[PDB]
Design a binder for this molecule. Structure first.
Ligand SMILES: O=C(CO)[C@@H](O)[C@H](O)[C@H](O)CO
Ligand SMILES: O=C(CO)[C@@H](O)[C@H](O)[C@H](O)CO
Ligand SMILES: O=C(CO)[C@@H](O)[C@H](O)[C@H](O)CO
Ligand SMILES: O=C(CO)[C@@H](O)[C@H](O)[C@H](O)CO
Ligand SMILES: [Mn+2]
Ligand SMILES: [Mn+2]
Ligand SMILES: [Mn+2]
Ligand SMILES: [Mn+2]
Ligand SMILES: [Mn+2]
Ligand SMILES: [Mn+2]
Ligand SMILES: [Mn+2]
Ligand SMILES: [Mn+2]
Lengths: 290, 288, 289, 288
């Protein structure tokens, strides 16, 4: 497996100097840095090429996460939003192609976080979504990009909350490059079984996010990491595992993730770095070759 | 310890004929029925007495749960909202005393569920709430009621998310009738240690809600029940334990709890009855 | 799934008035009573029909457990011990048939408990055992009995300590009536994964013993019961599940099981019955479907 | 917190060239090397100073483990055996003082492994042992050595099988240089609660052995490491943590520990080294 970490562990907005983080995680021993998609549509060609060259020169692979805006909601009942959305993704996937990125994940079938003050139509949203994802998927394939649909807890989305729902949705889409994506923090809430959910995902699992129950770095909390490693070995998971810790208050990240206390316990950057590296060593040790 | 269940397990709105449920759970074997406070202020003085009568007749003890509305938000920066909130609690609490209820719990220090659309001010809300709660505490003490502050996960509230934050708030309130309340569903998300959180609550723990990670009845999910039982013995817990399963879609309950799939797996009322009864045997066995 | 309990939970010797426990256990709600095989060769056909009819009357299914003596050692290098051993099971299995018992289990490929002051030849004992068991297995087929080979921890046996070893031994024996048997107390010591060991057992699993890490009744300890239910479901286990708690010091049972403190904490018979009943409610709830 | 490993992980007999292992574990990053006491009584005085020189040279602290032989049984009903036992330990402890080691642990109140084809007189053995250990304690105190009594599973000892029995024994001995010692492999069998056993030992815990359920190195097994680390933090443990993995068949070690299958799966020295270092990183990280 290839191990990565989301840059947002160090930042409070959905954008940053990704080159700085590529240099950092390469020194910490990671294989991957996952970056937020938000700023990419504003990258000039030379900026995309420099980012790509940076990743390549440092032996780092870039993956992309995206929490879509309501205006990029592929499941919208408004035909215009669905059109703006497909247009947004099309342009984004081409940028990913130029970046040599082959994976994007997150609530790509909806938007995030969900504004629950608006009325919900799961059934209706579900079918518009399946349709929209079907065609975005075709652009993704032409770009060499796997489009991973992340199963989320109920407080963050209502369409896909369990691995079974994720598999159902992905089978309906029925496209080779559209995958299910799990996240230990979300599984921790919705699943009857962690290993079971992973085996349920099976051949459809295309990406995995890690973090403790309250989103600390993997290892020192209650997530059943050994059971997870066993299940990944049962399904022959080949993919990437990207830890996504959020331990700092503040900014759009703190607000969207809902960090209302200093979970980092006053850590400075170097401290954060050390904990992520210990967490990487732990992940490689516990999660592999079971 | 005394075991109960929240009536909402069977209903989709924050009210119901509580008499029908006092008889149901008395039969199923529960010692307690927990009821939503919402419809109570619309109970006449006579309706109160028959509810109480109905409870005493069935050997069932009544506890109350309450997810406050924005207008009952004791943490509010708006003095008129705070004023109305103290009035609601004082009226609600006098009714509780006449109903012969000695415990109310929920996000009593705030409102539920939070609309994260508005602007949050944790620091200021926290100070206002501590003060408003201490006042309300005098009334709760009078009506012989335990004002229980429930620690909730980050998605449903931002003031108190861990047992440690709960104990800090309660110690700040510094009042006899205010307790910390824990819920296995919420602890499962926010805590480093389930047993550790319970031990942190210690003597301040006044009420406990149970449910699996995804809110099914206690037993066949991933919650560490043995560890909870051992930690309650460590602190010598002598309160009640109320299961709060939510396995049904629809209504204000389904929307507030966020049940977007049929977790009950098509259960009918009898099937719901059986599972709750089995979870009750399980809880008395494992937890004590 | 059918749920039972070992009568020994109440007794300190490997024999007892099984009719008394058949009645007790029917009132507590079990579907099965497991009895020790050692007193059965001393039973007349009258006692065998007596026991069978009584089980039948209280609706209880009977299963058998046996910790073989050194003289009943099917793996012994001494060919006379092996001949006497085969004679012993040949007789026993015919009695089981008369009792309409379709399952016996324990360290049937060896003897129990092992005396480590002796000489070990795991490789040698293993080969002799596979040979003897396959033979006994024909007699088992004939008597309609499932010969279950229990995987034990290292302190009690050295031949088969993990589900994988148990599976290798059974595959090698290669006979329909031989199955692997697992016990949560033994898996707790030896296995890397509990769900994994069950799954490795797979279709070869023919019997399951349960108890907490320190042998108390199932449920209030550290054994991962939910994980066990899942794995039993993953392999579609239909067999029975028998709790085998040991919480009392004294006697052969106490010395053989090595109970050196009062784990029951003063439990009198009624208290023991209460906990077994609660543990049985727990097992049906957590372990099934 | 100091972390070590028992040298027997790489050897099949209760002795070896400890200098070779001091260099190896310093290179892998350990703080401590734990050695078997067995060969030490017979160390010339030169060999004692060389061993100590090496340890200091490599920045390694040495701790000692010991499975006493039947003739060294301080609990024996036989007075000549108790006499020898006491002479054995006073000589061993004085050497330890020379070797500059401050900790010895194991079934020091008895002998190991127990021969169960003999008569078990628990109450009598227990009384004699408490009295004997108390005497030895005085010498241990003079040599600046913590005499740690290890709690073992039922198959390896019958006097002390739980943390509660270990604490009861140590409190009866009533001497500051005598401590309780826990081992995750042994707790995994006997305890109701791992965290609970650690909290029961509390201030009395003077040493801790680690290993997976089946004695593989810590990390990929079922032992609840986070719970252990949280309980060590609960009591404020000021001792060391020594992993005692046993993954190889053969010799006195393989038969005393009862390894009947190749648990190491063909590992050569280099592979045993890497797995030890990975478990060390895991332990420092998870146990805090
Ligand atoms: O689990 C999550 C969100 O809770 C991740 O998918 C990521 O943070 C999100 O997609 C926004 O970047
Ligand atoms: O756990 C919670 C909310 O998740 C409850 O205690 C809440 O106050 C109650 O559900 C309101 O009806
Ligand atoms: O678990 C075991 C032994 O520890 C049993 O299966 C044994 O065969 C039985 O207890 C003998 O009576
Ligand atoms: O855990 C134990 C024995 O199972 C050890 O501490 C023992 O004292 C040592 O292994 C002997 O060398
Ligand atoms: Mn995620
Ligand atoms: Mn931490
Ligand atoms: Mn922690
Ligand atoms: Mn609750
Ligand atoms: Mn057994
Ligand atoms: Mn008990
Ligand atoms: Mn040890
Ligand atoms: Mn217990």
């Amino acid at each position: 497996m290839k191990h990565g970490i989301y840059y947002a562990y160090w930042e409070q907005e959905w954008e940053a100097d990704y080159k700085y983080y590529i240099e950092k995680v390469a020194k910490l021993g990671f294989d991957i840095l996952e970056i937020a998609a938000s700023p990419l549509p504003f990258y000039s060609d030379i900026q995309i090429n420099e980012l790509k060259a940076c990743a390549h020169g440092n032996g780092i692979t870039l993956t992309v996460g995206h929490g879509p805006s309501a205006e990029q909601n592929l499941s919208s009942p408004d035909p215009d939003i669905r059109k703006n959305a497909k247009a947004f993704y099309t342009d984004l996937l081409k940028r990913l192609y130029k970046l040599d990125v082959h994976l994007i994940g997150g609530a790509l079938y909806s938007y995030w976080p969900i504004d629950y003050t608006k009325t919900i139509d799961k059934k209706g949203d579900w079918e518009r979504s399946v349709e929209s994802v079907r065609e975005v998927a075709k652009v993704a394939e032409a770009c060499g990009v796997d489009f991973c649909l992340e199963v989320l807890n109920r407080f963050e989305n209502y369409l896909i909350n369990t691995a079974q729902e994720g598999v159902d949705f992905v089978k309906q889409v029925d496209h080779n490059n559209v995958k299910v994506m799990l996240d230990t923090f979300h599984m921790n809430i919705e699943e009857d079984s962690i290993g079971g959910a992973i085996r349920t995902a099976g051949s459809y699992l295309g990406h995995l996010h890690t973090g403790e129950c309250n989103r600390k770095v993997p290892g020192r909390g209650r997530i059943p990491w050994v059971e997870i490693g066993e299940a990944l070995a049962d399904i022959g998971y080949n993919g990437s595992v990207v830890m996504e810790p959020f331990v700092r208050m503040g900014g759009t990240v703190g607000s969207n993730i809902k960090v209302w206390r200093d979970i980092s316990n006053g850590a400075d950057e170097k401290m954060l770095d050390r904990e992520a590296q210990a967490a990487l060593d732990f992940s490689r040790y516990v999660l592999e070759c079971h």
